[PDB]
Amino acid sequence: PQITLWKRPLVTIKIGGQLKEALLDTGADDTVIEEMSLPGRWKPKMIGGIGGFIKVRQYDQIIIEIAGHKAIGTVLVGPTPVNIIGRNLLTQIGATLNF
Amino acid sequence: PQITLWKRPLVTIKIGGQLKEALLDTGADDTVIEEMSLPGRWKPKMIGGIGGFIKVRQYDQIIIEIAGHKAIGTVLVGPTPVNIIGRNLLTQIGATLNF
Ligand SMILES: COc1ccc(S(=O)(=O)N(CC(C)C)C[C@@H](O)[C@H](Cc2cccc(-c3cc(OC)cc(OC)c3)c2)NC(=O)OC(C)(C)C)cc1
Ligand SMILES: [Cl-]
Ligand SMILES: [Cl-]
Ligand SMILES: [Cl-]
């Protein structure tokens, strides 16, 4: 698809068998989703945003569908109001920015 | 241009007579620039994201050239860790996400 930016670029994702809404975010290096349970072991990670740094849980090799495209990769879980799809998975679905 | 997302989508901007590097950020509602002086009136605003909220100054009707494309809109100035071009200006240069 071709998505304009007059509104937030929200799409549906499916993770752990659940539908959720998430933001396609070219300014996020990594994908960060709201607290939920995921399978397997996690590793610690620090990420920095507009207000400072926080601790999140890093889960590798997680299956996630994004706007109907299958991806498998790293998902960080932490306290956020929004699910954010960052560049590590935008590249797996072939997304580019165009103007 | 078509910008892939293997790396951060960084571009040159010109604002307030200054050349800067900034991140094209579809996840940002607003454009936020590191501390600098801008002409005109401003009012305080709080903006939040990973890590919490920061206080910024909101300047309206500011012109920015983004990778060679002129746009006008509101610009927030504050202690952001990176210059961010958000959707309020991305729309003006006709930027889209495609996959
Ligand atoms: C390394 O991987 C990542 C690191 C940091 C982020 S991020 O979310 O901090 N961010 C990186 C940017 C800021 C350099 C992605 C942004 O696009 C962010 C994504 C984004 C979109 C929508 C809501 C929130 C958000 C997150 C919160 O987490 C606690 C709290 C919150 O409260 C309002 C808002 C975050 N939006 C944003 O910061 O917008 C403003 C600059 C205008 C504030 C994402 C992945
Ligand atoms: Cl200055
Ligand atoms: Cl604006
Ligand atoms: Cl348009």
Ligand code: NA
């Ligand atoms: Na003004």
